[PDB]
Structures are given as structure tokens and as C-alpha cells.
Amino acid sequence: KYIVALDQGTTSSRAVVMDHDANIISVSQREFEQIYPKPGWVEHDPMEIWATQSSTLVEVLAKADISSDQIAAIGITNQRETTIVWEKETGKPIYNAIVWQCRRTAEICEHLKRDGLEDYIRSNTGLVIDPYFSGTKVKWILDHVEGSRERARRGELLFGTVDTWLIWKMTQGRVHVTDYTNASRTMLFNIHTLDWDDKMLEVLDIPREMLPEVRRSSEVYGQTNIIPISGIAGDQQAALFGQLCVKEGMAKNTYGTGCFMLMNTGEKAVKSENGLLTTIACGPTGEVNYALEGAVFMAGASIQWLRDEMKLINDAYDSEYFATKVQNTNGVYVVPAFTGLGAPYWDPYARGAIFGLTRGVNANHIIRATLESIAYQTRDVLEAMQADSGIRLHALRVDGGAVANNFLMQFQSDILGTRVERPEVREVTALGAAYLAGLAVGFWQNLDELQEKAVIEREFRPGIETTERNYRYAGWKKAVKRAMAWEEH
Amino acid sequence: KYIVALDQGTTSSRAVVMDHDANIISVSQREFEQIYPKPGWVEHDPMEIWATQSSTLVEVLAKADISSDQIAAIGITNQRETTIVWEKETGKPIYNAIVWQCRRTAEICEHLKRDGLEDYIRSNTGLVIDPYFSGTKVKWILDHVEGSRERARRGELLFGTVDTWLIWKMTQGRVHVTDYTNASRTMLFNIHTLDWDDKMLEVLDIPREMLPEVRRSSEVYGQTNIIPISGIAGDQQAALFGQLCVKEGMAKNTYGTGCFMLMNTGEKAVKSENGLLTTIACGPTGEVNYALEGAVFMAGASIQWLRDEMKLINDAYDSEYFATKVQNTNGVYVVPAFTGLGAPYWDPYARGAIFGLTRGVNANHIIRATLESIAYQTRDVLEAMQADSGIRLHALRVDGGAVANNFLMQFQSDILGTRVERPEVREVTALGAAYLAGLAVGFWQNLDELQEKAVIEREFRPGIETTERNYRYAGWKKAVKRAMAWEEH
Amino acid sequence: KYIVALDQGTTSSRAVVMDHDANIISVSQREFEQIYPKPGWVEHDPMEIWATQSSTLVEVLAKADISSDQIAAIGITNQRETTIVWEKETGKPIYNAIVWQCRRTAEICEHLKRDGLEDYIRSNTGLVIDPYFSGTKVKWILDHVEGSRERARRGELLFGTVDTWLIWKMTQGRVHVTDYTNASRTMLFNIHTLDWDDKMLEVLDIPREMLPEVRRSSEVYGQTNIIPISGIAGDQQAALFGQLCVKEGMAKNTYGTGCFMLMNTGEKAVKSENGLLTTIACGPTGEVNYALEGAVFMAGASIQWLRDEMKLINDAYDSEYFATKVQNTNGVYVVPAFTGLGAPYWDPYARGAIFGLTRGVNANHIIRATLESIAYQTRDVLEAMQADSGIRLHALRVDGGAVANNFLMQFQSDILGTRVERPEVREVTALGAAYLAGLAVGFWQNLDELQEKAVIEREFRPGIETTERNYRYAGWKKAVKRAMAWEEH
Amino acid sequence: GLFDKLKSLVSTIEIIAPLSGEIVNIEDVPDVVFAEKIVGDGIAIKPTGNKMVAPVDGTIGKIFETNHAFSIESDSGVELFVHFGIDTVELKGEGFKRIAEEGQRVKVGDTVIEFDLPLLEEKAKSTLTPVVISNMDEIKELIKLSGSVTVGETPVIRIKK
Numbered sequence A, B, C: 001k002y003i004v005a006l007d008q009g010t011t012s013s014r015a016v017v018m019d020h021d022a023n024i025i026s027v028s029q030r031e032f033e034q035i036y037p038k039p040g041w042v043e044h045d046p047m048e049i050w051a052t053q054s055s056t057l058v059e060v061l062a063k064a065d066i067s068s069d070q071i072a073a074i075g076i077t078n079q080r081e082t083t084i085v086w087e088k089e090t091g092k093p094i095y096n097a098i099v100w101q102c103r104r105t106a107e108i109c110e111h112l113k114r115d116g117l118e119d120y121i122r123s124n125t126g127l128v129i130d131p132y133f134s135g136t137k138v139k140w141i142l143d144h145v146e147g148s149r150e151r152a153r154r155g156e157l158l159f160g161t162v163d164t165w166l167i168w169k170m171t172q173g174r175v176h177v178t179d180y181t182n183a184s185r186t187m188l189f190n191i192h193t194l195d196w197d198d199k200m201l202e203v204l205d206i207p208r209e210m211l212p213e214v215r216r217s218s219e220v221y222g223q224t225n226i227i228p229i230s231g232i233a234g235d236q237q238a239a240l241f242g243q244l245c246v247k248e249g250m251a252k253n254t255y256g257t258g259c260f261m262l263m264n265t266g267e268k269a270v271k272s273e274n275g276l277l278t279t280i281a282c283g284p285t286g287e288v289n290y291a292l293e294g295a296v297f298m299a300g301a302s303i304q305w306l307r308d309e310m311k312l313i314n315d316a317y318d319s320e321y322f323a324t325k326v327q328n329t330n331g332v333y334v335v336p337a338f339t340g341l342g343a344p345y346w347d348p349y350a351r352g353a354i355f356g357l358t359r360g361v362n363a364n365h366i367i368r369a370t371l372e373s374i375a376y377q378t379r380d381v382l383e384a385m386q387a388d389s390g391i392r393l394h395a396l397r398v399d400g401g402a403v404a405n406n407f408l409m410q411f412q413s414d415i416l417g418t419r420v421e422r423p424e425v426r427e428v429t430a431l432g433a434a435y436l437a438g439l440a441v442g443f444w445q446n447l448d449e450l451q452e453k454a455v456i457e458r459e460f461r462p463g464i465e466t467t468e469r470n471y472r473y474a475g476w477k478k479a480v481k482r483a484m485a486w487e488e489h
Numbered sequence D: 001g002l003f004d005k006l007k008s009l010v011s012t013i014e015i016i017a018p019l020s021g022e023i024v025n026i027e028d029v030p031d032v033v034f035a036e037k038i039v040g041d042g043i044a045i046k047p048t049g050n051k052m053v054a055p056v057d058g059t060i061g062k063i064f065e066t067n068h069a070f071s072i073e074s075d076s077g078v079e080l081f082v083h084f085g086i087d088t089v090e091l092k093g094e095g096f097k098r099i100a101e102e103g104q105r106v107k108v109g110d111t112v113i114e115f116d117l118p119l120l121e122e123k124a125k126s127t128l129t130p131v132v133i134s135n136m137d138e139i140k141e142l143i144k145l146s147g148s149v150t151v152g153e154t155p156v157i158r159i160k161k
């Protein structure tokens, strides 16, 4: 039999099928619209998200006909923090999905820093007071609809990030559930108590009647007719798991839409003194482990911008070719602060900028500089992951869409000064959610039956250009300073 | 109250709302993928079609909140001839929608011409033996699945073009219906007897158990929960109706994806001796009228090709600007025979071609020549509509996506030598389906309450370039000869 | 010391320096405007040509400072057949350079075929009655200026192709000279008598007072202050010489602006019964040898068109990448008959055309098909060179701008079914003119001192796709038929 | 009936017959790149029954889209190329049915393309099926065998690396 994985990305919706070994038999992906109502804002349509994620589901199974009774279970991985609020009864959303990227709620984060409620939230959630997290996105939806909050005490409407959104639609409204890794990302959840924090619920005034039942990452939570829905983890926490980074000090970086670097820390919650987040991840059976994290908002979403709005490339694959036509970027820096700067900066008001322009700078210099910022951003948070930990990575394990760019992986190797290990399985976010489902449904009986599938296909070592490393990076560092606090407030 | 219109195009899916006057209050449109499995082939996914048409429906009503009980009825207009066959029980299609454009079944049309079954089908259907029509697309789906036809006598699976596809999905499978204008387009329907032709069913061996109940264009056929589904017409026959071309000799041309020119002939079926089709249209209450028709496959779908595959423009709107940068096309001709040549040629094997190239020919010459072929094609079938009728149009009434190109409308005026009347309502295909629904549901009580809404906004008269008319057109004529019968058979 | 080479192309002007071994020490190139006054016409400005060729000369010498007295001699290679006529006294041209490509004089070639003067000109010149050659381009300049011909008997104005144009400007008007290979290309020269043909001078009425002194390919003809001007050959005849194809049966193909394939035949003039030309080439010391030739007008000038007018690529180098993104051309054929069809067709009225278009055809299919026509054209004249000779090439020696496209060289190998030998010296047209100059000036004492410099750097053998060879080529063959005789006459 | 559910009587490098039939000389094939070993050297097979098989143990490389020919590479580093008939891309794959996928690991005898020899005799220019080593540069000695062969059983070529 097989296990199905729903992996609902910030930009795409992909379903993927696995056999009992671990193989990918079919992968369907269905990209959808990004809604920007005002400049620092991003939004998806909750229905366009479910429309796409269903299409994919009823597409992998048909692609090679197989259905309902050759399938053990369903795992769910999803993009984190984007908040949805819907009418329980009608199953209709009272707004659009305010995405993780969106900067709309910076004013609410300011009131929260004014109050001196800064140290409480880093301590009890591991997070930062920043628009990224779910918490204050729920306050904004309630503060902009008329009567939504009273109606939320009377229970007519309820909250959820994308994992609880999708399972509700799949289980005709019956079960309404989050897992631990996904709940932690809301700023409404205590990471110690492992349950919704009630001061954090009071300062933003969310009725606890809205919230889900935070269940666990491997466990059957309901059925699906469309059959056991048994796994859930935030896509970055399941990618750490498909990478089998299930013991302490083990880490990976995903070059997806943004770049997310996490490191398992086991049973200990480590306080970041260097701009990182303390989140929750899974241990070898799907239990609560803590992790350390750096979130940058902007990796391959920058290549999406050169292709769709700027129209400089046609494919994102073409970025490798035009970038290796020039040799250097002529002095140009690109800071992709399109939705502010994530870790370790955490600046809501920073915007994207291009720097050092001269008349001889052409489009290949801009394309090469966009690819370079993915690498420099990764150096910013890696440099921070060592100061917080103590560990020194001598290799870097990667995954994502963008790891198929050989120039980026090599440039990443030179600017870092470490080796960069690349798997022949690029799809490890889906796999991490599937192992998570197979586990609960007795399909696998833990990770050692999956160890012999982490082939590390290509390896990237520092060539002789790694001697420019610091010179190149000091130009990136003075470039970021100047994109900081652009938006006035 | 309001009436809703579902207008499901070859490329887009659009829903539009009307008040009791006639106004468009909201219009949602959701474009979808075109599948080309082999070169002369086009296919849509039946589920991608319903997915889009539902999205739109549950989008116009929300766009300005209104639902189920401020709405009199639902009208359905749809792209004609594309065949779907599905599992009655599961509501799952045994193939993709073989589109009207698709050239896949040319071999079956050849066996039908070999048999001397040419004059029978022009007589009893008004149509031509050509891959365009539905008939032989159903034979190909049955001849390529294993067991599909025996299963079709035992009734497990049934046929439908897009109107019967959409209403089935909307009425949970209960009613399975076509109208007269839509049924006539299949080559399986007698236009005299006004019921399925049983010789045409035998030569292609379709079980009559597959077919729909051919009901009428204005009549409540069922309800919809999602409420009276009361109107249905093929999109070109409803555009003739929104244009109020409801009496004989009245005509219009739509510049949509293809160019379709129809003329009402009332109670008489006129035999075309000049490459046109004898189809069915509506009379002032939605009754059977006959019409005369010229179908060209290729109008704004050619501008879609310059934007998506060639990447020469970014918007289709940009075609006007780059085309009026040059003054002439330097001798270049474009023949958009991408899916063969429709009327009056009817050549399955003709393919697209560009002609007269020189080193000084740039991209604006190609863009201007693509816009010109829309105009020359329209001259080909207008010239034929006069030879078949006897009438001489002194103006040309138009509608469509592409009528917002002022250069095309003006070039159309010069190459024809007649005036070109343009409405301020571009959306008359939807409206024609809505009047059709309002009628049955007692919402309007016929067309004179809608006469004072046919304002003819801009008028285009022949400028002094109409003296080049024939010289320009004789170059188009020797260009078509050479794109003919490219594909070998 | 060094030898300088002036190589004045149809599109570029390049000067290149050689040491006593054979090395290229410096190469300057200066591209210039192509003038198209009417569609089938091409023209260069005689002054824009000399302006560029001087710039280059006074640029290689400076590039690495060296001047006048470290240089043995100057060799001249030039594009063939383009006619210039100038005022002897003022050194000002009475028109623009009517290029070899230009189709303007097709009407004069028709009068010449009407007269039955077809067999005389193939016999005494080896050429075809076609606008390509110089002869009738001189009649058109004289027939369009008022008084130019009487003034040409009184000697105020004189004729020359680009070699005699450049040496006149370099030798302040003193010497006015052509070589044998360059004179033969005019249609005004007997290839047997090796002197201007006086019937050919009468039928087009050129005063013999206009003509140059046809000197030889290696010989000091004058000095240059700017110093012995000692070599001259038409660029295709000097490329045969840099390739050391100096004995019979030896051949090469240049993929330059057009594709020119020549084969040395020694002391014999072979009559082409298969659409080729009988021209003149050099033997081991620069003596008259005869050669066999196929001229196609349109090779990398087609890639210039996609870059400059169509704007599909930015570099011609980019054609390899986008062409190898697709795998096939989807059925598309490109016939680059921009200036009619050269050998073996010789159709003045044929124009460029693109064929087999479908909605799924994108820009990479068109780019790949443009590169393919260079290969198919080369198969057309190679196939003819064997029927005229008897020889069967088992390898193909190449040179040119376009041989750096590895996809084209490989596709050329598969469509031909032979190996394709490629030198690490791409610049062999310049070198062939320089050896030609070194020879006369005692700098080298013949070719064996230059044999050990024909390294054949990359070799291309037929991969497994050569089995499609004929299928692919039969589609090219029915495509050409349809671009033939487009222009009406 | 058909016999694949039934276990079969089972079993210097050999190249086992991609097809059943009689051997013909590669130089007796009417297409010059095979007849003169331009694309490789090896032999042809005049086929007698409906399927082409994997000729060695390796990975499939390219099945052409007309499904008339495939390339494979033995783990003993040999690239063989099997191509049904000559100028067969014209049939636009009409008589073939692709059984396998391009990156596919295989063993000797595993089916890769099934055909319809009654239609192909009737329509192809030639039905003879070349099987050549397209990396001849890499190999020392080549011994060609003769007579009748049966698909997946009988050897045709012995190479020594």
C-alpha cells in the first residue's frame, strides 16, 4: 500500500504518493494566486487554497489509479502562521488568509512592545513580537469585522492556521485540530505548559472558544471519505523530519519561498540571545522536541518576482544560466525585504532595495545578485545558530525547490566556507509528513526503516573563491542597514 | 432581484450578475489550462472546468453579498461542441474534454466521406464532416477505452457537451439535459425532426442511452441548491440573442477565441452553397429559429499565443500599441491555422504559418499581422454569408473580448468596406443567456423591455485606407493556399 | 614581424594580426548598419564600410603597439559580389553598395533568360542568371543615375567590388585592382580566358573603362602609408585556403552570415548539373585553381534576425541554450528565404516562412528551428556536391562564427550522417588572406610551414538520432516548396 | 492463451537477443549509418514475434517518443542501441506500445517495447532491427554470432572489455 502527503505551500499545493519503501510514485502541484491588497501585504484565498489542495489529492490517486483502499493514511504539512477565521456553520471565511509574510499588523506589535510584554512572549512561546506570527493577525480580523468577536464567544466562528483549515474541510467539520509544531507558531501558545497561553489570549482578546484542540504530530485525528488522517507538522518542522534530523545538534536549511534553517535540540528549550526563535519540532516517534530556528521570508519568492513582475527570466531554472553569464555582480546588492526582514533582523518596516548601480550594470548582474542574497541571508542566520548553540556545522544539509540551482549551492558553499550536502530527494517536506502519518498508522514502526534512503547525492565544497567570502559579505552587511526602516511609522 | 449567468468559455470561466434593468453588477472570471497532448490536439480537464465555474459562482454572489434568495434564476452559456463522457455513478470522467478545436478525429471524418455519407449529414444536421463537431469525438473516447461502449448500453456512462456537464454537477446528477442550439452542434442531432438522428448514431455506434434529453433554451429544467436553472444556449447563439438579433437577416460577429458570425433566418433552414453551416438559434421567446454561420477557430486565441508561448507582448491589450507602431506589416502574412482552417475552408490538415519574411521584419510586423488575420478571416465568411443569403450588410454588429482593440475594429472596417457598430456592453454572451433565463422564470416577459440597452457606443467607418482593401486581401488569399494541407495523410 | 589581415564581412569589419608562427595576437571587429530600402533589398554604405575597416586597422596595431615597420604585409579578404560605383575624382560613391543578398535586379535576370543567354553565362563564367552576382547590379546603378554611363565612357566613374574599393581608399586612388577569385563573381568575367567577357559587357552595356585590372591572389599590387598590399581573395575562397584545402577533392563549409561550401577541383573546371556554381579558388602558391560551390544566403544572419528584429534572444550565443531546452521543434519548420533561395534552388522570389504552427508552439521551438535550417541547407548543397563530383565526404571541415554552437554542429552531424571536424582556429578566413600575403612578400615560402596548425579541435560524430535524418529532412523539403515563388512577377 | 504468469525454463560479456528472429548482417541493412557502422557496429535481426526485450542488465536511457527504439547501458559499461526497422519515425509510433520508462533499471529479458509485426511488415520500409554498440571506442574485441535467435534467450554478440 501507499501513504498520501498533502503539502500546501505558500505558493503551490502539492500532493505526493509513497509506497512502502519511500519512493515518490506521483507528484501533482497546483500553483495559485498571491493577493497583495496594499504594498507590505500578502493574502491568499482560503477557498483557492482548498480548491487547489483537493484537485491535487483527486489527481495523484488518478494519475496512476489507486483509491481509498490501497492507502494506509494521509499526512498534512502546510505553510505556517497564516491565519484563517471562518463561520463554523456555513464553512465560509469572514476574510482572506492573512499570510505569514504580511506586514499589516505591525501597529499591534508596537502596542505589545510599548506595554513591556516583550520578555513574557519570548519566554513562554520562544517567539518575537513581529507581524509574522498568527496571534495579532487574528486580532486584526476580529477588529475589522463588525460583531465577529461577540459572535466568537457565542461560538459561531473559529480560528485556524492551514493544517486545521484543511482537515476541517476534509472531515466535513467534525474534527477541528492543530498539532504542536503548528500551534507553537501562533504566539497564542505556551511552549512549556504545551497548551494555549491565557495572558496572550487576554492582551489580544481572542475567545478561547475559537481555538483548536492541539493534538500531536503522529496520531489518527479523524477519517476522510474523499482514509485515516494521522500526521501533521508545519512544513519546516516536517522537512527537518524527512531529513531525519531527529537528534540534537542535527540541522537543515530549506530554500523554498523563504529560507528556514532549524536545528533539533531535543528535550531542552534553548534561549536565543542572537535573534533566533525557539520553536517545537518532532523527535524519533513524533514527540515534542524543541528546535532552534532562523526564518528568512525571501528566498525563491525573489526568483518568482524576476519571472512574474519584472519578466526578466520566463523560468526560475533560467536564473542559473544568466547568473553564470557574468562572473560577478558589478557591485550590485539586492536586499529582498519585500515583506520586511525576518531573522535575525526582525524589522517590519524594511523594504526591498537594489544597490550600487552603474550604467554598465545589466540584467544578468541583477539576476545573479538576487541568487546571491539567498546565500548571504543563510549566512546571517547560520552565523547566529552557532553563537546560540556552540556547535559548528562542518556541512550543511539542504532541501527545497531552489536547491536544484547548482550556482546557488556552490555560491552558498563559498560564502559560508562549509560543505553543502544535497539529497537526490528534493521533496523531503512531504516525506517528513508522510513518515509522520505512517508511524501512527503502524505502516512503518520508526525511522531506521527509512535511514537507508538519505543518499546525499551531490556535495559542494568551497572552491578557491571562498577567499572573497568576507569582502563579498561586508558589502551585503552595509546594504541591509540601508534597506532597514524604510516604511515610516 | 438578480439573475446569474454562467458563461464558460474555451479559455475562461466567467459568472456575471444582472439586476432587473440589465446592468452588470459583478463579473468574475477564472482562466484555466489548455492541454495539448500532441500538436493538432486540444483538451480541457472536465474537473478544472467545473472547479473554475463553481469558484466564479461562489464569487459574484460574495463580491457584493447576495445569496440564493435575491436571485430569480441561473442562465447557462457554454463553449460548443467539446465532448465529455463520464461515469454516471461516480461523476468522474473517463477521459478529458476533447475540445472543438482539436483535430484528433480527422481519420473518422475521412471514413465518413469515403462512405458517401457527406450529403446526408449536411441535410439532416446542417453541418460539415469535420473534427469540430461532437459526434466523432464521442466515437474516439469509446474506441480508446476498453469496455466503455458495452458499459454505455448497460447505462453506466453517459455523454454531454459542457452545458449538460455543468447542470449535472449543479443538480447532483438528477437532471441530464441539453438545449436545441447546443444539441444541434453534435452531428448526432436532426435539425428537422428536432431529435437525435438514428443513422448518425449507427454509423459512429453511440448507444442512445448516453444522450441527453434535448430540452429548450428558456424553460426551468431543474433547481440548484449551491435556484431555478432556466436558460441554456451555446455561447454564440446566446450572443446573437444578447445582441437582440432575433428577427431574420439580423446578424453579429463575435471576436472571442475564434470568430463566429451568425445570422438569424427565422422559420427557414437555408442550405449553404458557400462553405457555411446551418445551425439552430433562438427566436424572441427562446424558440427554435434557424441561423446561418461561419466559424473561424482562431481570433484572440492567436493573441494568447503571442503572449504566452512567443512572449512577444505581456498583455493582449498591448497588441494595439505595437501593431500601430509600424503602419504596415512589410509584406508579412499570418495564417492562424493552429487547429486547421474552419469556415469556409474546412481543412483539418492545414497548420499555422507566417509568410513573406525579410531581414527588416521585426516583432511589431508579426504582432500587426496577427491582428490583421482576425479581420481577413471575418471577410472570408462575411463574403460567404452574402452569397448564401442575398442580403448585403451595410454595418456589422460586434461583440467579444477583442472588440476593445480599436485598431482591429478600424482595420476590420477598412478591409470590409462597411461600418462596424460597437456596443458599450461587451459582455453580451452572458446577457443573452440571462434574458433567456429571466424569460422562463417570468422575470422579464420578453425583449422589448430590453431593447433600450442596445446603445451602439462607438461606430467605425471606412477611412481612406479602404482603397487598399482588395490588394491587401489578395495577399491573404494566396497565403492561405500555402498553409492548406500541411499535415500529411 | 607580423602580417595584418583585413576581413570585411557582410555584417562586421574585422582586422587581425599574425606573428611568424600563425597565432592570432589581436582581433578587432566593428559591426555596421544593414540598410533595407524595400523588402527584398539590402544595401551597405561604402563609406560606413571604409570607416569601419580603417577603425579596425588603426586599432589592432594600437591594441598592442606595433606600427608600419614591424609589418611585412597586408592581406585583403572581403564579402563577394557587392557592387560599388564611384566618382574617380572625388572618391565619393554615386549610390550605396548593392549587396549580394539584394533581390532588386531580378527583372534584369529575367530579360537575360528571355534572350536565351542562359547557357552562354554558365559556360563562360560558371555562374547562374541570378541577382546575387555583380553584373546586373552595375547595370541598375547606371540605369538609375542620370548621365552615369556616358560619364563612364569618358572615365569619370568606375566599378569595383569591396576588395578594389578598400585598396583604392588605402592607396589614395593610385591602384584600382581585383583578384581572380573576386573578379569571377561578377558575371562580367570569363573563367576560361581569365579576363573580362565582352559579350557580357555588351548585353548589360558596361563601359570596359569602369572595370579593374584583375591581378592575382598573391602578389604586391601597391603600397599603403596609413605597407605592401600583397594578398586578395573573396572571403569564401580565402577560408578554403586557411583550411589548407589546396588540393582536389578537398572541401570546407563556412557557417558565417550565409553558408558557403566550396571544393577545390585543381586545374579542371567541372560543369555542375545539380544547381552548383563553378568558381575560381587558389592553389598552393595562390594560383588559379577552379572550385565547386554552394551558396546559401541565410545561416547566422537568421540568428541576427531573432536577436535584433524579433528580440527573442539578446546574444546569438543564447541560441544554443534555448534551442536545447525543448528536444524537438514540435513540427515547426523555418525557411530563411529572406533574400530568396540560393543554391541549389536559385529562386529570387521566394521569401522567409515559418510552418506547422500549433498553439503549444513556443519561442524555443522557433529558435531551435532557425538553427536547424542552417543544417538542412548545408545538407541540400552537400547532397549536390556529391552528385556533381563523385566523391563522398566522410567528414566535414568547418569554420565560421556559428561553428561555436555545439548543438548546430551536432545536429549537422546527425542530419548529414557524417563526422564534422572543427578547428580551434575559428578565424580561418583572415588567416587564408594573410598566408596569401605572406607568400608574396616572402614571409612564408608556402603552406607546409603552416600545415602544423590545423589541429581539428572537436570532432562531431552521428549520435543515435541520425536515424531520424530523413524523416526530419522530408519535412524541410516540403516546407521549401511552399516558400518558393512568393513574390509575384 | 498467453504464457507470462507461468515460470519459464531459465537461462567476456554477452548480449542476449532483444528480439526473436534470424540474424542478418549489419551491412545488409538498407541504411548507410548502420550498413557502414557510422552510429555503431553490431548486427540486425529480421524479427519474427511481437516484443523487444532488455538485451543486457542495465538502465534504459532513451525510448524514442515513437517507441520504435531504445538505448541502454550495461553495468559492464556498454551502450547498445536497438532500433526496429528503418525510417520508422514516419509511422508516428503506430504499431508500438511503450512498456517501460526512460530511467529504468532492468535485467535481461525484461520487456521494453511491444510491437505488431503484421502491421509493421505491411507498412515499414524495412523491418530488420539493428542492435549496435554505440561506444565502440571503449571496446577491444567483438564476436558476432549467427542463425536463429529467440527473444531473451539466445546470444547474438560477445564483447571483451
Ligand SMILES: Nc1ncnc2c1ncn2[C@@H]1O[C@H](COP(=O)(O)OP(=O)(O)O)[C@@H](O)[C@H]1O
Pocket (backbone or CB within 6 Å): A009, A010, A011, A012, A255, A256, A257, A258, A299, A300, A301, A302, A303, A304, A316, A317, A318, A319, A320, A400, A401, A402, A404, A405
Ligand atoms: N532553479 C531555481 N533557482 C532558484 N529558485 C528556484 C529554482 N527552482 C525553483 N525555485 C524557487 O523555489 C520555490 C519553490 O520551492 P518549494 O520548496 O518547492 O516551495 P515552497 O517554498 O512553497 O515550500 C519557488 O519560489 C521557486 O521560484
Ligand SMILES: Nc1ncnc2c1ncn2[C@@H]1O[C@H](COP(=O)(O)OP(=O)(O)O)[C@@H](O)[C@H]1O
Pocket (backbone or CB within 6 Å): B009, B010, B011, B012, B255, B256, B257, B258, B299, B300, B301, B302, B303, B304, B316, B317, B318, B319, B320, B400, B401, B402, B404, B405
Ligand atoms: N485588446 C485585445 N486585442 C486582441 N485580442 C484581445 C484583446 N483583449 C482580449 N483579447 C482576446 O479575446 C479573447 C477573449 O474573448 P472572450 O470573448 O471574452 O472569451 P471567449 O473567446 O472565451 O468567449 C482572448 O482570446 C484574448 O486574448
Ligand SMILES: Nc1ncnc2c1ncn2[C@@H]1O[C@H](COP(=O)(O)OP(=O)(O)O)[C@@H](O)[C@H]1O
Pocket (backbone or CB within 6 Å): C009, C010, C011, C012, C255, C256, C257, C258, C299, C300, C301, C302, C303, C304, C316, C317, C318, C319, C320, C400, C401, C402, C404, C405
Ligand atoms: N553561437 C552562435 N550560434 C549561431 N549563430 C551564431 C553564433 N555566434 C555567432 N553567430 C552568427 O555568425 C555570424 C558571424 O559569422 P562570421 O563568419 O564571423 O561573419 P561573416 O558571416 O560576416 O563572415 C553572425 O551572423 C552571427 O549571428
